[PDB]
Amino acid sequence: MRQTFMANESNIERKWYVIDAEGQTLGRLSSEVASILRGKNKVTYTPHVDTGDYVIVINASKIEFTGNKETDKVYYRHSNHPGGIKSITAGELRRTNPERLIENSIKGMLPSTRLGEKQGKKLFVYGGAEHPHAAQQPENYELRG
Amino acid sequence: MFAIIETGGKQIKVEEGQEIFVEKLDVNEGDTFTFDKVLFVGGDSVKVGAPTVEGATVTATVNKQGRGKKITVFTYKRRKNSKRKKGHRQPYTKLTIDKINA
Amino acid sequence: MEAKAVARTIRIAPRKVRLVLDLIRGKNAAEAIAILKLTNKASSPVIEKVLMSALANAEHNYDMNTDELVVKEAYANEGPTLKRFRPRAQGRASAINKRTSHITIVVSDGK
Amino acid sequence: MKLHELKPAEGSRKERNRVGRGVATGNGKTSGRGHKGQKARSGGGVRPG
Amino acid sequence: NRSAVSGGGRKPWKQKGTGRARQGTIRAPQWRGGGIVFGPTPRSYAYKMPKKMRRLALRSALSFKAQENGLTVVDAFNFEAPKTKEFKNVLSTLEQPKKVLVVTENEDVNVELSARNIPGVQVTTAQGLNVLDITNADSLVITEAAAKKVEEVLG
Amino acid sequence: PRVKGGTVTRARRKKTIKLAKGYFGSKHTLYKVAKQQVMKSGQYAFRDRRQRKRDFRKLWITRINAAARQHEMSYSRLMNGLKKAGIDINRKMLSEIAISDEKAFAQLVTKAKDALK
Amino acid sequence: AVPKRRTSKTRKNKRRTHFKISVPGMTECPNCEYKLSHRVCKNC
RNA sequence: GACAAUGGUAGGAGAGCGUUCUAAGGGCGUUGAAGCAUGAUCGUAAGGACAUGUGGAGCGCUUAGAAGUGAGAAUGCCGGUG
RNA sequence: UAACUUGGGAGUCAGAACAUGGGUGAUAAGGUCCGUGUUCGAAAGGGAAACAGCCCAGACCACCAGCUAAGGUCCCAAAAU
RNA sequence: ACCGAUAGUGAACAGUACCGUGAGGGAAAGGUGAAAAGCACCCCGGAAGGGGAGUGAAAUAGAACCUGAAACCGUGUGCUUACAAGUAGUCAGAGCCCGUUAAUGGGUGAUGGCGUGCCUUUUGUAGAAUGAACCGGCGAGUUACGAUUUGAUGCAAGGUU
Ligand SMILES: [K+]
Ligand SMILES: [Mg+2]
Ligand SMILES: [Mg+2]
Ligand SMILES: [Mg+2]
Ligand SMILES: [Mg+2]
Ligand SMILES: [Mg+2]
Ligand SMILES: [Mg+2]
Ligand SMILES: [Mg+2]
Ligand SMILES: [Mg+2]
Ligand SMILES: [Mg+2]
Ligand SMILES: [Mg+2]
Ligand SMILES: [Mg+2]
Ligand SMILES: [Mg+2]
Ligand SMILES: [Mg+2]
Ligand SMILES: [Mg+2]
Ligand SMILES: [Mg+2]
Ligand SMILES: [Mg+2]
Ligand SMILES: [Mg+2]
Ligand SMILES: [Mg+2]
Ligand SMILES: [Mg+2]
Ligand SMILES: [Mg+2]
Ligand SMILES: [Mg+2]
Ligand SMILES: [Mg+2]
Ligand SMILES: [Mg+2]
Ligand SMILES: [Mg+2]
Ligand SMILES: [Mg+2]
Ligand SMILES: [Mg+2]
Ligand SMILES: [Mg+2]
Ligand SMILES: [Mg+2]
Ligand SMILES: [Mg+2]
Ligand SMILES: [Mg+2]
Ligand SMILES: [Mg+2]
Ligand SMILES: [Mg+2]
Ligand SMILES: [Mg+2]
Ligand SMILES: [Mg+2]
Ligand SMILES: [Mg+2]
Ligand SMILES: [Mg+2]
Ligand SMILES: [Mg+2]
Ligand SMILES: [Mg+2]
Ligand SMILES: [Mg+2]
Ligand SMILES: [Mg+2]
Ligand SMILES: [Mg+2]
Ligand SMILES: [Mg+2]
Ligand SMILES: [Mg+2]
Ligand SMILES: [Mg+2]
Ligand SMILES: [Mg+2]
Ligand SMILES: [Mg+2]
Ligand SMILES: [Mg+2]
Ligand SMILES: [Mg+2]
Ligand SMILES: [Mg+2]
Ligand SMILES: [Mg+2]
Ligand SMILES: [Mg+2]
Ligand SMILES: [Mg+2]
Ligand SMILES: [Zn+2]
């Protein structure tokens, strides 16, 4: 007989975490943050509802790469105009927009569904050691790595 | 207090007074049925069977010997002029849990 | 109560009638009369006559208020279609549908 | 034996096979003829021998 | 069939080029008002069986009447003039069911006339006995002479 | 004799159309597309009755993984410990216990850890 | 040149969303029922 | 009771569902037949009931018999309507 | 656990890929022609992103039970950061 | 154990209407009610058409007249929908609205998984190969006489006309 618990908006409790990016590898931090955003760390995980938590990433400018990714990892985008292929290196992106660097890295590890877009909207990335969400009282979170 | 019982090749979490639906048991409505395979007993005192809690029973009262909602099983293979339609109603026994006897 | 009038087999296509009908649905009788009088569409005087007939039914047959009436319902159903043909080039004939409408108006005092 | 209780002898009667009446019979569509060729045609087939 | 329906000689339109389905006659079977494919054709349904089987069937019907207490033998029918009421009363006095077959040795005109109009009553001679008539009846009313003649002819 | 087409055609088609209640547009209206969609629905439902068992086992495993990592353990090691401890509680029950009774689940984790060490 | 597929009821009514007429611009006649704004009575 | 088997095209074999008509038996119907419409009903399938509305005079059931006996496709035919 | 014989009823005579032994071609072809095996044809399910013919494996029906195969276990996306 | 208005005559009301120079080809079209009792009279309207009032068992039987399916066209609204990528369903599923042939009910459905119609023809078709605008009706292994085989039944060195 059917007995499996199903979370819903009436019983889900979403928390706030702050994660320090300084000294961390890009994708290794990113995959754990993606897990947190999707509620995979909750015993009440329910695939059709958002059980995940809010994540604040600080010190985005201090994220680290291995190898020659600073100059050899390239981000491409197309403008949907006949020759509109544009590019930027991972190093130049880290220099000029580290919040975009980390946000894109994390969102690339979330489903492209409606729920996935909603869950990615719970991510807040900042290049420095400060964030404006003191009112939500985030708790420090340590990556298992 | 809850117990995990094994019946019908499946496991069910029960509490006293709960109505449960299990695969058909050889029993009549109104009769008392005792479940002998208790894997786990919860609550204040917690008991863990390896795999069953020795001496533990869950007794219940049969409320109904029914058949489930009709399922129309239909399959086909396109372009092969081949298909099959069959009805199915799965028997079940409804019971109400009376006493968890650890 | 409610009073009704119907004009059946009006030789206007229901698509065109319904455009005017949409203007007066739910409006007060006097407002609907003014709308129909000032609307520049072929259906307008036909619909106006149906509405006048409904108001006359109200007054004469049910002794209704005649000044607190609203257009409770107003719709046009499809009547039988006159099938016609237009000669085209190369000796070919093309179908012409001369559609008709059934026009209904219901007025009521709301009681 | 009454006229309202008639019974043929067991095994003496058998229902005839009607082809081309749907897929489930197994003789629908091609009606047992297979696909194409001379033997699939109305009036089709070579003379005996 | 398509050959017997009136008209339909000409090809309705040319084989190719018009965009329509190819057609050969307006009386083809898929056309409204067209010829019928197969369908009923006048024929007989009568068939025959060996004479010995016919005799066995007659004996079986008579024997079934005998077992089910459906055989009544009367001395002789005494009917000088036809009168349906008299035959009705006679069947009343013999405790007969509704469906009765009356068997006389030869053609008895007065018996046939008196029993003709009574529903459920049928009259035949010994020579005229057939399986449908015997089987339909609930009881048999046969004279002594007719019984003897039946026994002689059917052995 | 002649057998007219009669009422059987309409009855069969109306059955299919009623089965297509709630479908989009013509798929709940016209017999041909309704029949095609009802066939598709039967095939999908047959496939999905089998897929449902996979889906729910997966959900229970995900929840058990979360609960076990709350006790510094992975799913795979926890299940290995439970098997070595002779505990036969299946995944639905384990996930329901983890949701409902945290303390009982903690005792189960203790037993699994003890059977491994 | 020709429709590849027929237009459903839904698409047709979607397209007809804006196919409508508006209430005439009309004002009450202070002395002489209702009239078009900036027009004379022409019948009163 | 206890063991086995049960994917399937051409195709072979078996068992059934439903349609119209006939015979016999037994029934229903103006206190409302057939048909139609709606429904959360029953059967392993084809399919079978019941209740309510509409309808206004015919129709089931059982056993057997006989077929113009079952349509989604034929650039199919006719009609209606997009 | 079949085999054979005698009868009633067939359908089939366009095959395809893969592996392998060879001809042909150019130790070209998703080429072509033979030998051998498998699968597809007439086979759904899991894997190979998608993908008849490859790998695992042959669906009587139901289950919100369990163990495994190929293949896998950072996130997408189940299981070892 | 023939048809029952697309059937049965082509024709239930026609070799007409219509087409063709002509020979010739050749349709569609049945049903008020038991009885015309076929709606006096009043009201809106030029009329058409309606709403009443009457007739009738019934007028949503009012002559375009028995029943009145589907496609198709409208009016009202219980749930839902304007950040979303799709063979339209299916499995999971909150929220809201209802309450049944009372059944581990009905309607709708945020959101998640899975998912390239059908038929034909093909080695192989989501196929950009064929066919179907939709709905309805009609539309294809029949019968006769022979042959052979199987089952059934009667009789049997005979069986049968
Ligand atoms: K082509
Ligand atoms: Mg000209
Ligand atoms: Mg077959
Ligand atoms: Mg077919
Ligand atoms: Mg062949
Ligand atoms: Mg073919
Ligand atoms: Mg061929
Ligand atoms: Mg021919
Ligand atoms: Mg001819
Ligand atoms: Mg008939
Ligand atoms: Mg038909
Ligand atoms: Mg099989
Ligand atoms: Mg199998
Ligand atoms: Mg066969
Ligand atoms: Mg059969
Ligand atoms: Mg039958
Ligand atoms: Mg009938
Ligand atoms: Mg037929
Ligand atoms: Mg067609
Ligand atoms: Mg059209
Ligand atoms: Mg090669
Ligand atoms: Mg090749
Ligand atoms: Mg080979
Ligand atoms: Mg095989
Ligand atoms: Mg496969
Ligand atoms: Mg597979
Ligand atoms: Mg695959
Ligand atoms: Mg690839
Ligand atoms: Mg796949
Ligand atoms: Mg590949
Ligand atoms: Mg395992
Ligand atoms: Mg995965
Ligand atoms: Mg995982
Ligand atoms: Mg008719
Ligand atoms: Mg005719
Ligand atoms: Mg009138
Ligand atoms: Mg009137
Ligand atoms: Mg009137
Ligand atoms: Mg009237
Ligand atoms: Mg009526
Ligand atoms: Mg009518
Ligand atoms: Mg966006
Ligand atoms: Mg939105
Ligand atoms: Mg899109
Ligand atoms: Mg998908
Ligand atoms: Mg083939
Ligand atoms: Mg080819
Ligand atoms: Mg397609
Ligand atoms: Mg296309
Ligand atoms: Mg072709
Ligand atoms: Mg086409
Ligand atoms: Mg059609
Ligand atoms: Mg033949
Ligand atoms: Zn004025």
PDB file of N, CA and C in Angstrom, chain C residues 38-78:
ATOM      1  N   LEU C  38     -27.105  54.021 -32.837  1.00  0.00           N
ATOM      2  CA  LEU C  38     -25.904  54.718 -33.275  1.00  0.00           C
ATOM      3  C   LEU C  38     -24.806  53.792 -33.793  1.00  0.00           C
ATOM      4  N   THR C  39     -25.066  52.496 -33.923  1.00  0.00           N
ATOM      5  CA  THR C  39     -24.067  51.574 -34.447  1.00  0.00           C
ATOM      6  C   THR C  39     -24.260  51.414 -35.951  1.00  0.00           C
ATOM      7  N   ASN C  40     -23.175  51.583 -36.704  1.00  0.00           N
ATOM      8  CA  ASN C  40     -23.223  51.579 -38.165  1.00  0.00           C
ATOM      9  C   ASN C  40     -22.883  50.179 -38.677  1.00  0.00           C
ATOM     10  N   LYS C  41     -23.858  49.277 -38.566  1.00  0.00           N
ATOM     11  CA  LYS C  41     -23.738  47.909 -39.055  1.00  0.00           C
ATOM     12  C   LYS C  41     -25.106  47.461 -39.548  1.00  0.00           C
ATOM     13  N   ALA C  42     -25.112  46.596 -40.566  1.00  0.00           N
ATOM     14  CA  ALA C  42     -26.374  46.188 -41.178  1.00  0.00           C
ATOM     15  C   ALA C  42     -27.282  45.470 -40.187  1.00  0.00           C
ATOM     16  N   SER C  43     -26.706  44.735 -39.236  1.00  0.00           N
ATOM     17  CA  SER C  43     -27.507  43.997 -38.267  1.00  0.00           C
ATOM     18  C   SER C  43     -28.262  44.911 -37.309  1.00  0.00           C
ATOM     19  N   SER C  44     -27.822  46.158 -37.156  1.00  0.00           N
ATOM     20  CA  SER C  44     -28.323  47.012 -36.078  1.00  0.00           C
ATOM     21  C   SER C  44     -29.833  47.218 -36.092  1.00  0.00           C
ATOM     22  N   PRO C  45     -30.488  47.559 -37.210  1.00  0.00           N
ATOM     23  CA  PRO C  45     -31.953  47.719 -37.154  1.00  0.00           C
ATOM     24  C   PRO C  45     -32.706  46.413 -36.954  1.00  0.00           C
ATOM     25  N   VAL C  46     -32.199  45.292 -37.471  1.00  0.00           N
ATOM     26  CA  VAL C  46     -32.837  44.003 -37.209  1.00  0.00           C
ATOM     27  C   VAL C  46     -32.802  43.693 -35.715  1.00  0.00           C
ATOM     28  N   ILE C  47     -31.622  43.829 -35.106  1.00  0.00           N
ATOM     29  CA  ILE C  47     -31.487  43.588 -33.674  1.00  0.00           C
ATOM     30  C   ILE C  47     -32.334  44.577 -32.889  1.00  0.00           C
ATOM     31  N   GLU C  48     -32.403  45.824 -33.357  1.00  0.00           N
ATOM     32  CA  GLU C  48     -33.217  46.822 -32.679  1.00  0.00           C
ATOM     33  C   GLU C  48     -34.679  46.409 -32.667  1.00  0.00           C
ATOM     34  N   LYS C  49     -35.177  45.892 -33.791  1.00  0.00           N
ATOM     35  CA  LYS C  49     -36.557  45.426 -33.834  1.00  0.00           C
ATOM     36  C   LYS C  49     -36.779  44.240 -32.904  1.00  0.00           C
ATOM     37  N   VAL C  50     -35.814  43.319 -32.825  1.00  0.00           N
ATOM     38  CA  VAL C  50     -35.966  42.206 -31.883  1.00  0.00           C
ATOM     39  C   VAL C  50     -36.028  42.718 -30.445  1.00  0.00           C
ATOM     40  N   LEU C  51     -35.170  43.680 -30.102  1.00  0.00           N
ATOM     41  CA  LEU C  51     -35.155  44.222 -28.745  1.00  0.00           C
ATOM     42  C   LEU C  51     -36.449  44.966 -28.425  1.00  0.00           C
ATOM     43  N   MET C  52     -36.942  45.773 -29.367  1.00  0.00           N
ATOM     44  CA  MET C  52     -38.231  46.430 -29.187  1.00  0.00           C
ATOM     45  C   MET C  52     -39.334  45.408 -28.980  1.00  0.00           C
ATOM     46  N   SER C  53     -39.303  44.313 -29.742  1.00  0.00           N
ATOM     47  CA  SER C  53     -40.306  43.272 -29.574  1.00  0.00           C
ATOM     48  C   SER C  53     -40.216  42.641 -28.190  1.00  0.00           C
ATOM     49  N   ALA C  54     -39.001  42.410 -27.695  1.00  0.00           N
ATOM     50  CA  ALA C  54     -38.850  41.847 -26.356  1.00  0.00           C
ATOM     51  C   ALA C  54     -39.383  42.796 -25.287  1.00  0.00           C
ATOM     52  N   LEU C  55     -39.081  44.089 -25.414  1.00  0.00           N
ATOM     53  CA  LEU C  55     -39.588  45.078 -24.463  1.00  0.00           C
ATOM     54  C   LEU C  55     -41.110  45.184 -24.525  1.00  0.00           C
ATOM     55  N   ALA C  56     -41.678  45.116 -25.729  1.00  0.00           N
ATOM     56  CA  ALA C  56     -43.130  45.108 -25.869  1.00  0.00           C
ATOM     57  C   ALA C  56     -43.741  43.864 -25.240  1.00  0.00           C
ATOM     58  N   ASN C  57     -43.100  42.704 -25.415  1.00  0.00           N
ATOM     59  CA  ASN C  57     -43.556  41.498 -24.729  1.00  0.00           C
ATOM     60  C   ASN C  57     -43.564  41.716 -23.227  1.00  0.00           C
ATOM     61  N   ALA C  58     -42.444  42.193 -22.687  1.00  0.00           N
ATOM     62  CA  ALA C  58     -42.355  42.498 -21.266  1.00  0.00           C
ATOM     63  C   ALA C  58     -43.559  43.315 -20.816  1.00  0.00           C
ATOM     64  N   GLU C  59     -43.739  44.487 -21.427  1.00  0.00           N
ATOM     65  CA  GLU C  59     -44.777  45.410 -20.985  1.00  0.00           C
ATOM     66  C   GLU C  59     -46.165  44.801 -21.139  1.00  0.00           C
ATOM     67  N   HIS C  60     -46.489  44.304 -22.332  1.00  0.00           N
ATOM     68  CA  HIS C  60     -47.863  43.904 -22.607  1.00  0.00           C
ATOM     69  C   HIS C  60     -48.223  42.562 -21.973  1.00  0.00           C
ATOM     70  N   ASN C  61     -47.353  41.557 -22.067  1.00  0.00           N
ATOM     71  CA  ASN C  61     -47.691  40.218 -21.605  1.00  0.00           C
ATOM     72  C   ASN C  61     -47.363  39.974 -20.137  1.00  0.00           C
ATOM     73  N   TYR C  62     -46.398  40.687 -19.548  1.00  0.00           N
ATOM     74  CA  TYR C  62     -46.026  40.395 -18.173  1.00  0.00           C
ATOM     75  C   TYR C  62     -46.050  41.611 -17.266  1.00  0.00           C
ATOM     76  N   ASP C  63     -46.461  42.773 -17.769  1.00  0.00           N
ATOM     77  CA  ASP C  63     -46.606  43.979 -16.962  1.00  0.00           C
ATOM     78  C   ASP C  63     -45.310  44.306 -16.223  1.00  0.00           C
ATOM     79  N   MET C  64     -44.204  44.245 -16.953  1.00  0.00           N
ATOM     80  CA  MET C  64     -42.900  44.523 -16.379  1.00  0.00           C
ATOM     81  C   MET C  64     -42.596  46.019 -16.440  1.00  0.00           C
ATOM     82  N   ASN C  65     -41.503  46.408 -15.778  1.00  0.00           N
ATOM     83  CA  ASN C  65     -41.299  47.807 -15.410  1.00  0.00           C
ATOM     84  C   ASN C  65     -40.984  48.693 -16.611  1.00  0.00           C
ATOM     85  N   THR C  66     -40.360  48.135 -17.653  1.00  0.00           N
ATOM     86  CA  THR C  66     -40.077  48.805 -18.923  1.00  0.00           C
ATOM     87  C   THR C  66     -38.974  49.851 -18.808  1.00  0.00           C
ATOM     88  N   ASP C  67     -38.539  50.150 -17.587  1.00  0.00           N
ATOM     89  CA  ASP C  67     -37.451  51.090 -17.361  1.00  0.00           C
ATOM     90  C   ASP C  67     -36.345  50.513 -16.497  1.00  0.00           C
ATOM     91  N   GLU C  68     -36.563  49.357 -15.881  1.00  0.00           N
ATOM     92  CA  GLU C  68     -35.560  48.651 -15.105  1.00  0.00           C
ATOM     93  C   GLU C  68     -35.127  47.362 -15.791  1.00  0.00           C
ATOM     94  N   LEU C  69     -35.341  47.263 -17.096  1.00  0.00           N
ATOM     95  CA  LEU C  69     -35.010  46.061 -17.842  1.00  0.00           C
ATOM     96  C   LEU C  69     -33.566  46.111 -18.310  1.00  0.00           C
ATOM     97  N   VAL C  70     -32.899  44.965 -18.246  1.00  0.00           N
ATOM     98  CA  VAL C  70     -31.560  44.811 -18.786  1.00  0.00           C
ATOM     99  C   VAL C  70     -31.614  43.742 -19.867  1.00  0.00           C
ATOM    100  N   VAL C  71     -30.656  43.805 -20.785  1.00  0.00           N
ATOM    101  CA  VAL C  71     -30.540  42.774 -21.807  1.00  0.00           C
ATOM    102  C   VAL C  71     -29.842  41.585 -21.164  1.00  0.00           C
ATOM    103  N   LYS C  72     -30.630  40.687 -20.572  1.00  0.00           N
ATOM    104  CA  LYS C  72     -30.061  39.551 -19.855  1.00  0.00           C
ATOM    105  C   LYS C  72     -29.344  38.596 -20.798  1.00  0.00           C
ATOM    106  N   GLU C  73     -29.945  38.304 -21.944  1.00  0.00           N
ATOM    107  CA  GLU C  73     -29.351  37.388 -22.901  1.00  0.00           C
ATOM    108  C   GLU C  73     -29.524  37.952 -24.300  1.00  0.00           C
ATOM    109  N   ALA C  74     -28.522  37.721 -25.140  1.00  0.00           N
ATOM    110  CA  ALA C  74     -28.568  38.176 -26.524  1.00  0.00           C
ATOM    111  C   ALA C  74     -27.639  37.271 -27.315  1.00  0.00           C
ATOM    112  N   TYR C  75     -28.196  36.470 -28.215  1.00  0.00           N
ATOM    113  CA  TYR C  75     -27.370  35.551 -28.975  1.00  0.00           C
ATOM    114  C   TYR C  75     -27.983  35.319 -30.345  1.00  0.00           C
ATOM    115  N   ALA C  76     -27.142  34.874 -31.270  1.00  0.00           N
ATOM    116  CA  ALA C  76     -27.566  34.540 -32.622  1.00  0.00           C
ATOM    117  C   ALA C  76     -27.144  33.112 -32.923  1.00  0.00           C
ATOM    118  N   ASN C  77     -28.107  32.268 -33.263  1.00  0.00           N
ATOM    119  CA  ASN C  77     -27.840  30.910 -33.710  1.00  0.00           C
ATOM    120  C   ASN C  77     -27.891  30.838 -35.232  1.00  0.00           C
ATOM    121  N   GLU C  78     -27.339  29.754 -35.767  1.00  0.00           N
ATOM    122  CA  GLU C  78     -27.263  29.555 -37.209  1.00  0.00           C
ATOM    123  C   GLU C  78     -28.585  29.031 -37.751  1.00  0.00           C
TER     124      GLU C  78
END
